[PDB]
Amino acid sequence: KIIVKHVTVIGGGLMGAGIAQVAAATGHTVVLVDQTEDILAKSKKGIEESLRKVAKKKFAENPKAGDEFVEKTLSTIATSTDAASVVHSTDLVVEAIVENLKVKNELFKRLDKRAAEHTIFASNTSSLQITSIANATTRQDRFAGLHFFNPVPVMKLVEVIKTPMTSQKTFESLVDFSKALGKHPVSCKDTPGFIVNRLLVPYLMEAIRLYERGDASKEDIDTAMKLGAGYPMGPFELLDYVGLDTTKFIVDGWHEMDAENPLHQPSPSLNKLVAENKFGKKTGEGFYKYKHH
Amino acid sequence: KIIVKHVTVIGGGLMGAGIAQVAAATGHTVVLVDQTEDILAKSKKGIEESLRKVAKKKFAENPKAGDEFVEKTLSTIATSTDAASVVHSTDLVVEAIVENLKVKNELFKRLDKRAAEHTIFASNTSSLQITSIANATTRQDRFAGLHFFNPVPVMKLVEVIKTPMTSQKTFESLVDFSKALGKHPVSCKDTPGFIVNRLLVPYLMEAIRLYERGDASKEDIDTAMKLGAGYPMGPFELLDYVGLDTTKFIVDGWHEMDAENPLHQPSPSLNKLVAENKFGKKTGEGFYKYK
Ligand SMILES: NC(=O)c1ccc[n+]([C@@H]2O[C@H](COP(=O)([O-])OP(=O)(O)OC[C@H]3O[C@@H](n4cnc5c(N)ncnc54)[C@H](O)[C@@H]3O)[C@@H](O)[C@H]2O)c1
Ligand SMILES: NC(=O)c1ccc[n+]([C@@H]2O[C@H](COP(=O)([O-])OP(=O)(O)OC[C@H]3O[C@@H](n4cnc5c(N)ncnc54)[C@H](O)[C@@H]3O)[C@@H](O)[C@H]2O)c1
Numbered sequence: 001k002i003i004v005k006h007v008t009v010i011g012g013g014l015m016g017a018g019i020a021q022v023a024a025a026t027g028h029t030v031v032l033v034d035q036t037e038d039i040l041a042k043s044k045k046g047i048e049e050s051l052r053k054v055a056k057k058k059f060a061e062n063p064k065a066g067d068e069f070v071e072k073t074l075s076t077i078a079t080s081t082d083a084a085s086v087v088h089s090t091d092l093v094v095e096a097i098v099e100n101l102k103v104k105n106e107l108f109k110r111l112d113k114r115a116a117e118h119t120i121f122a123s124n125t126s127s128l129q130i131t132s133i134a135n136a137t138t139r140q141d142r143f144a145g146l147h148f149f150n151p152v153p154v155m156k157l158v159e160v161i162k163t164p165m166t167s168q169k170t171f172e173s174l175v176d177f178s179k180a181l182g183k184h185p186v187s188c189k190d191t192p193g194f195i196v197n198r199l200l201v202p203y204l205m206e207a208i209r210l211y212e213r214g215d216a217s218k219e220d221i222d223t224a225m226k227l228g229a230g231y232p233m234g235p236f237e238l239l240d241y242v243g244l245d246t247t248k249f250i251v252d253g254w255h256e257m258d259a260e261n262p263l264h265q266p267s268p269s270l271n272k273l274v275a276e277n278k279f280g281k282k283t284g285e286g287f288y289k290y291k292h293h
Numbered sequence: 294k295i296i297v298k299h300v301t302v303i304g305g306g307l308m309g310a311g312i313a314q315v316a317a318a319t320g321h322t323v324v325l326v327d328q329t330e331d332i333l334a335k336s337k338k339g340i341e342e343s344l345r346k347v348a349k350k351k352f353a354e355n356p357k358a359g360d361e362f363v364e365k366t367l368s369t370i371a372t373s374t375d376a377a378s379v380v381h382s383t384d385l386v387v388e389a390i391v392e393n394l395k396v397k398n399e400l401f402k403r404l405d406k407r408a409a410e411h412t413i414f415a416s417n418t419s420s421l422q423i424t425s426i427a428n429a430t431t432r433q434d435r436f437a438g439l440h441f442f443n444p445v446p447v448m449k450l451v452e453v454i455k456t457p458m459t460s461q462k463t464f465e466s467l468v469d470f471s472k473a474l475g476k477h478p479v480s481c482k483d484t485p486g487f488i489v490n491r492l493l494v495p496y497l498m499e500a501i502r503l504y505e506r507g508d509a510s511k512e513d514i515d516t517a518m519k520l521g522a523g524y525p526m527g528p529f530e531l532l533d534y535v536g537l538d539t540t541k542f543i544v545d546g547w548h549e550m551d552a553e554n555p556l557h558q559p560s561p562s563l564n565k566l567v568a569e570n571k572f573g574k575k576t577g578e579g580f581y582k583y584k
Contacts, residue, residue: 149521155520155521156520157516157517157520157521159517159521184516184520186509186513186514186516186517187509187510187513188508188509188513188517189507189508189509191506191508195503195508195509195513195514195517195518195521196517196518196521196522198499198503199496199499199500199503199514199517199518199522199528200518200521200522202496202499203492203495203496203499206491206492206495206496207492210484210488210491210492213484214482215481215482215484215488216479216480216481216482216488217480220479220480220481220488221479221488221492223450223477223479224450224452224479224481224488224489224492225488225489225492225493227448227449227450227477228442228448228450228452228488228489228493229489229492229493229524230524230525230526231522231523231524232523233523235492261555262554262555263555263556
């Protein structure tokens with residue numbers, strides 16, 4: 001077996017940055033990639049802030065030990081603006097850039113040419129077909145989905161997505177990598193939503209519909225699911241948390257593919273908030289208003 | 294206003310006994326009704342056991358008081374095999390009998406003729422139209438749904454289901470009672486599944502379907518929802534907890550009442566387990582095997 005040691009993370013946004021942090025804090029050598037040296041600087045700055053915050057809590061009894069912990073993790077994270085310049089010596093590429101099929105394919109089609117023969121390619125895409133992105137290369141046996149959850153340093157789950165072309169060898173290596181990250185990998189076919197979103201999102205939509213239908217208030221529904229179902233967050237609270245735009249985008253996709261399916265019918269309230277740019281906790285307001293920090 | 298103090302709980306089963314216990318534990322006078330003395334005898338025994346299990350921990354430093362707390366509570370629960378003889382002056386009737394609409398209606402239609410004027414009637418039914426029961430009486434203004442969750446003494450949520458005919462006075466009385474029970478009432482219309490089950494059951498069926506499609510294993514799905522969604526139990530673990538037959542029954546109902554809706558399509562796997570009497574934990578086996 002070829003064990004993942006060097007990881008190239010493409011995209012230093014909410015997800016990528018978190019993936020880089022966890023990979024680096026667990027002993028992997030990482031190269032975080034993004035479009036500009038500024039974006040990278042900002043992303044790395046966010047990773048530091050997050051680590052120091054974790055350190056000031058784990059090593060509360062010893063600041064020096066906390067600093068060392070942060071410095072060692074942070075120092076194993078290099079940054080480059082062109083992934084092509086470093087994949088020839090990387091073991092795994094984890095992509096977390098814009099959720100646009102064409103962009104991702106252009107990305108992987110090119111990297112395919114620079115990457116070492118054993119290099120595995122993985123996409124953290126939530127709504128696109130791993131199979132579609134994989135066929136943008138001739139490395140399908142070494143391509144799969146590696147789906148994380150926000151905040152990455154905190155959420156322990158990772159969905160390892162296998163296309164009909166992914167090799168068992170590629171699959172096992174990602175499972176191993178997942179455990180090496182301190183996460184718990186689960187397996188799922190390359191089907192829309194995979195496991196979590198496929199069971200989570202349609203439920204959140206049903207919650208919105210029960211509310212639009214006026215059967216009960218948002219507040220009551222949230223109370224009902226937290227106390228009655230034991231959920232950490234009521235559905236409206238979670239919607240604002242994951243992002244109403246993020247959610248609408250996923251559902252539009254499903255609706256597009258099967259407009260006749262009632263489960264994916266659009267939500268007026270959801271569309272309205274998104275139109276009004278009320279994306280949730282991101283913009284200080286979604287279905288609920290939040291204290292603009 | 295109408296302050297509920299004397300309560301009639303019809304049905305001393307899983308839900309019934311729990312409602313009786315919490316009502317009694319919170320200072321209400323309670324009369325528990327069921328079909329036989331043996332059933333009632335066992336129901337009241339289960340209540341005593343549950344109360345004692347608690348007292349032993351809470352009154353460790355003073356067992357005497359603990360036993361008195363239990364004594365007081367049990368002595369505030371009466372039992373009867375004849376509902377009609379009890380409702381003449383009760384403030385509230387909470388029903389939790391077999392999920393059969395006919396039986397329920399006959400029950401309430403009969404009791405409507407016995408209950409005092411101010412008496413409020415309420416059903417704990419999960420998959421039935423509160424309206425399809427209130428109309429079985431002429432007390433529609435004092436009829437509502439009051440849906441509790443198992444274990445009643447643990448679950449703090451209570452869904453107060455109001456119908457178009459339900460009085461506001463009746464509504465606020467049930468809300469006040471819910472709070473008196475130390476519970477937290479939420480409001481919903483007499484729409485199927487109310488809030489909780491309406492949003493939970495279909496999700497659980499979807500989990501089964503993902504499994505039946507061959508997309509992932511039950512274990513991973515369970516793990517996925519626990520770690521990825523922060524749920525206490527994975528869907529299959531929960532299905533076995535709430536009961537597979539219980540669930541199937543609710544899904545079939547919605548399926549018959551609207552066979553066009555994809556969320557209510559029957560599950561081969563679910564039906565099979567029910568057929569071969571594998572109902573979940575309460576049977577030692579459902580999607581998983583226990584003990
Ligand atoms: N945030 C979530 O809830 C979540 C959870 C799981 C998976 N995802 C998936 O992860 C991916 C990124 O999500 P995000 O929330 O981290 O996004 P984001 O907008 O926070 O960050 C994306 C980063 O990608 C960079 N980027 C865009 N195009 C690029 C290109 N051609 N080359 C290099 N870098 C490029 C941007 O500059 C940006 O810093 C998406 O595919 C999304 O569907 C999101
Ligand atoms: N998941 C649950 O267990 C749950 C949760 C919420 C609501 N409910 C609802 O609560 C009610 C009962 O559920 P349960 O789980 O307590 O059931 P159960 O079968 O444990 O207990 C019902 C009790 O009702 C008695 N009963 C039946 N018909 C009667 C009649 N005509 N008169 C007097 N007693 C009668 C039985 O003998 C039995 O002891 C149902 O309407 C159901 O839909 C169940």
